[PDB]
């Protein structure tokens, strides 16, 4: 038993992390085949003031890049912007390039952060994409270019590269195709996060996890239909739920229907009344149905 | 968020994980050089009742082991006990044996779990050793033999191997010397954990993280001497603090002395009075000064 | 019943295949009117090293060309490039030139390969163009200049000519206007493919085919709106579906709405849980709605 | 009976329309919650020359915004781009904000325009998206920021905001994520539409509608195979027809197969020779088959 925010193993990703230096900036890049992807602000002379990315790119000389894996240096032969990412061609093919794909993550979807410092992987932890396109990712200075990945269906996906922290502390990155999540821009300017919508599927998953791990005080003799829940959700900042199908396994193993947990959400959203569920004092949407099933019953 | 539990990258450990089966038992082993270490209860014919490990070893048949590292099957040359672990001489040297050391973690110290499921690494997360020798993880059937490690100087230390779950849900394992943390026996018998002694160092770190995070409601300018606090701790199931020097960074930084925070601990131990600290409803001792320092600042 | 990746019949295409040799190089050409078209790398002295195609063309000697076909007598009169294709004017019109057009295939579209080995038609099989402009076929040494075609609306279209295989093993060719699909270079250099977007239309067709052939385990009667589905698709490297109109016959015949299949896709993309669908282990996008319809209902 | 181009009722949208004036520009905004969304060219010094939107936004004066609904003046507090849309944060939340989603419409699809004139909703009418991502509406100076919407599943979707007219008179707007349909840019530069490809599906429905109204002078006893037509279609800037859709509802209730109508399209494409069909003197592709079915029969 037990519920913890976990990350999938980082082994296959670690050999792809390199140190990218330009000028007085140092951050992290992703080395796959003969190219390195990194945040394009590594070439910005002053990341604390407004950045003219056109001018910065004209100013670039390839020989000013320093790219290193451990301390074997990789020479850059070509550089281009792709969206908010720099794509740098190097002569050396990463001999440990894993089989992989690029995709993005949706609100509610969980993924793994390999947080890196100046080319050195330092920690790994699970996060969850929020509706405004931000994560709570505990990034600090020196961690830009840190990589988010998912393992799903035996496929390694790269889904995130870290760029910046908003004023409210939320974290903003791009996918590996240079599109910033949330449409935020890679500028030190004031950018507002906005209305965060709770992932309903995840909250249902949380309550199932609660049931499996011993906690049951919140369930009553009431259940509400999926439609009625989706009506409620659309005006209380919760996602609609498409299908109960995702939880079948969880309903079967616990004997609790999705419709009962839906009613629980409506109630519990108004407070826990002092009590806690799995130590949390409020509903938590950071765990997907998949994460819960994995953790409770094996991959 | 603010303060989140992290793990260190698992890449160097993953190639050491093997699937070990004997009879109806399947768990994980640690493959280092030409040996595999795993919980000796893998050869227990019935893990639901008391086990005579002398007899079990006596009647072991070496060809009844199945040991596998993905692509590779290993043959067992000899079996012996080291404490509560089996040490199995195998016919093949692990080509990916990393540079490693062994140590035991002490109460209050954090480490990483590579949760493995019948030979396959599935997840990575951080835990903290409690005074009674237990951790609060998330282990299910199939995860015995899962490995705990720290990346330190800057080498790899193996510190934990998973064996069992107590009636109260706490998790129990051994060091790689075969000594069960907390002295629990590897038997399916009732075993009491005993009273948890909170790590004062970690709780001070917790409160610094809260202050760093802008939460001030619990502090006064009133302080408490290190000697005074330790007097209290001794009869309130909190560790005594040796010295204050480990917090100098956080102290100088927040402008709050350790002594002030000691005052907070004695007061907050009587209850949070319906407020929270970093979304917690009571004092948390799972984050070390190191963790808080690192997770907030320049490595 | 049954589902098989098929090829339209190759008879009309077979008389158009000729052997083109130059120096030690031997491959295939398409003979139409008074022109033979083939991959330009036939005139490269060493295809295992990078090629200067301007130098190679500058020093072509027309009498070094060898064109052969069992029922013809052909001399090269002239040569020039069109993109990556060599276009040879010959001194004889193909008497068996069929009515034909050139067109390019788009991502998701299926076509036929006539695989030829040094001028000799050897096999024929169906393929599907992926979003990165590659196909998964089966080409070896001697098969360059193998021709792709579609019979579409009573019309013969030539759509492909084979040039090379990427490091990852995907197959690359040009249209008959000499434009390489996916913009790859006809160089023995290292070139990366990137991530293929799955055709949602094809995946939907494939599930319909599965249903018709008695596969039912994956389907439930919960449906997902086109809108919801497309939001998911946009981030999961699937194409968005424009109208369900192309499925109306399949939906009528099976009694299953597209919306019910859209829900299946979101589920099944996470994995089959170890199960199969028509012997496949993951979702398949190589079958178009057209391919499925004429195969299941002959129209 | 009878066939008119219809709009869905506009009541749910009308309370969201506000007047947005900045400097010398006056257009319409969409007030949802605490945001007013409008075309970003409202803050351009000079809409008659190339515009530097980075600078215009850089130098934007939030107090020179005059936003009025009711006669209530909203105060701007924050401006940003979201693609080609300006998103303004305002000082009062729209109490009449309806429940809504955003989606994009695709070529061939029908949707609703609420034409607004410098802040006042003035008319509502149906449009259909053309192949190049344009519509033929009726927009003049003062109508920018007019809104397109669809009602589906009782759900309100915002799908269009009006930006400009092309040189040829075709109308161009964005979705509410600020992506301009047809990839046009919000510049007073020359921009070519591309050649318009009529939707064959929509023309069939139109002809079916005509038959139902008792107009049949244009239909003969002869037919055209689906493959003959599609061949004709590529040549004559018409889209290819996929299956027969369940034109079967129409086919059955009219007696005429699709194939008969395809022959009509080819004949009628030349011109109607003085006569008309439902008042038109040329083929109309603005009605979808679904649209026609509901309009005539109700579903």
């Amino acid at each position: 038993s037990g519920l913890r925010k976990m990350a999938q193993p980082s082994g296959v990703v670690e050999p792809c992390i390199v140190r990218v230096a330009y000028g007085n900036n140092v951050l992290n890049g992703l080395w796959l085949g003969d190219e390195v992807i990194c945040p394009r602000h590594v070439i910005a002379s002053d990341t604390s003031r407004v950045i003219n990315y056109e001018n910065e790119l004209s100013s670039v000389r390839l020989h000013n890049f320093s790219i290193a894996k451990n301390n074997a240096f990789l020479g850059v032969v070509s550089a281009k912007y792709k969206g908010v990412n720099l794509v740098l061609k190097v002569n050396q093919v990463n001999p440990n390039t894993p089989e992989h794909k690029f995709k993005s993550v949706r609100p509610g979807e969980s993924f793994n952060i390999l947080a890196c410092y100046e080319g050195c992987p330092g920690s790994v932890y699970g996060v969850n994409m929020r509706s405004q396109g931000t994560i709570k990712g505990s990034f600090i200075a020196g961690t830009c270019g840190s990589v988010g990945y998912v393992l799903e269906n035996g496929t390694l996906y790269f889904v995130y590269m870290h760029h910046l922290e908003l004023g409210n502390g939320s974290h903003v990155g791009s996918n590996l195709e240079g599109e910033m999540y949330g449409g935020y821009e890679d500028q030190p300017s004031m950018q507002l996060e906005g209305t965060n919508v709770m992932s309903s599927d995840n909250v249902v998953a949380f309550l199932y996890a609660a049931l499996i791990n011993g906690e049951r005080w919140f369930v009553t003799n009431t259940s509400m239909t999926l439609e009625s829940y989706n009506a409620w959700a659309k005006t209380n900042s919760f996602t609609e739920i498409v299908s109960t199908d995702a939880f079948n396994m969880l309903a079967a193993k616990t004997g609790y229907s999705v419709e009962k947990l839906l009613e629980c959400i409506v109630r519990l959203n108004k407070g826990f009344g002092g009590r806690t569920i799995l130590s949390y004092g409020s509903l938590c949407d950071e765990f997907t149905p998949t994460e819960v099933i994995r953790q409770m019953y094996g991959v």
Side-chain angles (χ1 to χ4, degrees), chain A:
Chain A
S1 68
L3 181 70
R4 305 281 324 258
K5 233 320 177 182
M6 289 164 191
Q8 297 168 303
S10 57
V12 68
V13 178
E14 292 172 45
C16 307
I17 305 300
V18 295
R19 181 189 177 274
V20 183
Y22 192 98
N24 230 73
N25 299 322
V26 178
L27 45 61
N28 306 278
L30 183 62
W31 181 28
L32 303 157
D34 67 342
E35 61 179 41
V36 176
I37 300 168
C38 74
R40 66 175 172 169
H41 62 67
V42 71
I43 64 171
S45 319
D46 177 10
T47 49
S48 284
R49 256 57 62 176
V50 200
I51 299 162
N52 182 321
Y53 280 109
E54 276 197 7
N55 286 5
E56 294 290 355
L57 190 65
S58 298
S59 304
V60 162
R61 306 262 82 79
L62 300 185
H63 70 257
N64 288 330
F65 284 102
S66 176
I67 298 188
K69 179 47 170 193
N70 299 330
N71 236 339
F73 283 84
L74 308 176
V76 169
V77 294
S78 172
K80 55 183 63 181
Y81 287 162
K82 190 174 154 190
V84 298
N85 293 338
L86 215 35
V87 181
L88 308 170
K89 211 173 192 161
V90 297
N91 282 311
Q92 303 82 340
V93 170
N94 185 355
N96 301 294
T97 304
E99 251 197 82
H100 66 277
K101 298 184 183 180
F102 295 166
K103 77 170 199 161
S104 303
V105 294
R106 316 179 54 222
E109 184 164 3
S110 275
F111 59 107
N112 317 289
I113 290 296
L114 182 56
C116 302
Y117 183 77
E118 297 205 6
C120 289
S123 70
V124 62
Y125 48 95
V127 295
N128 187 262
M129 183 56 66
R130 302 148 90 185
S131 67
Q132 294 307 312
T134 68
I135 61 181
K136 316 198 300 181
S138 320
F139 295 105
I140 63 184
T143 68
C144 278
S146 288
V147 168
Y149 64 95
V150 189
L151 302 163
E152 162 181 287
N153 197 16
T155 303
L156 167 63
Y157 294 102
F158 297 103
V159 303
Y160 181 96
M161 180 160 272
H162 186 56
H163 287 248
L164 55 95
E165 181 179 299
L166 300 171
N168 63 1
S170 306
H171 292 116
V172 171
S174 68
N175 64 16
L176 274 305
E177 294 189 87
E179 308 170 291
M180 202 71 89
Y181 287 102
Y184 293 95
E185 47 191 25
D186 49 344
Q187 299 280 347
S189 64
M190 243 291 308
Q191 314 192 53
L192 292 167
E193 181 163 1
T195 295
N196 177 72
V197 185
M198 286 280 212
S199 162
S200 289
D201 305 84
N202 291 1
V203 176
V204 167
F206 178 63
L207 294 176
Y208 276 121
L211 293 175
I212 302 167
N213 272 276
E215 247 151 357
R216 319 175 47 260
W217 60 262
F218 51 80
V219 50
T220 57
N221 71 342
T222 301
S223 33
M224 81 185 299
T225 88
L226 186 55
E227 287 176 307
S228 321
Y229 178 80
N230 289 334
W232 175 86
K234 293 204 278 158
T235 68
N236 290 258
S237 302
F238 270 74
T239 54
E240 288 181 80
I241 288 181
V242 170
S243 68
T244 58
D245 300 339
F247 309 99
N248 296 327
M249 164 143 194
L250 297 170
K253 254 146 188 311
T254 58
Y256 290 82
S257 71
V258 176
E259 285 85 357
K260 295 181 184 179
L261 295 198
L262 292 186
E263 156 73 22
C264 291
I265 292 167
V266 177
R267 285 189 283 100
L268 288 169
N269 191 64
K270 293 157 177 206
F272 283 16
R275 283 150 311 181
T276 76
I277 298 174
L278 283 163
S279 305
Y280 300 78
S282 48
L283 296 176
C284 166
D285 72 339
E286 289 180 334
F287 298 81
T288 69
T290 292
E291 267 176 304
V292 167
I293 291 163
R294 260 192 232 139
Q295 190 169 147
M296 299 297 97
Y297 304 112
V299 177

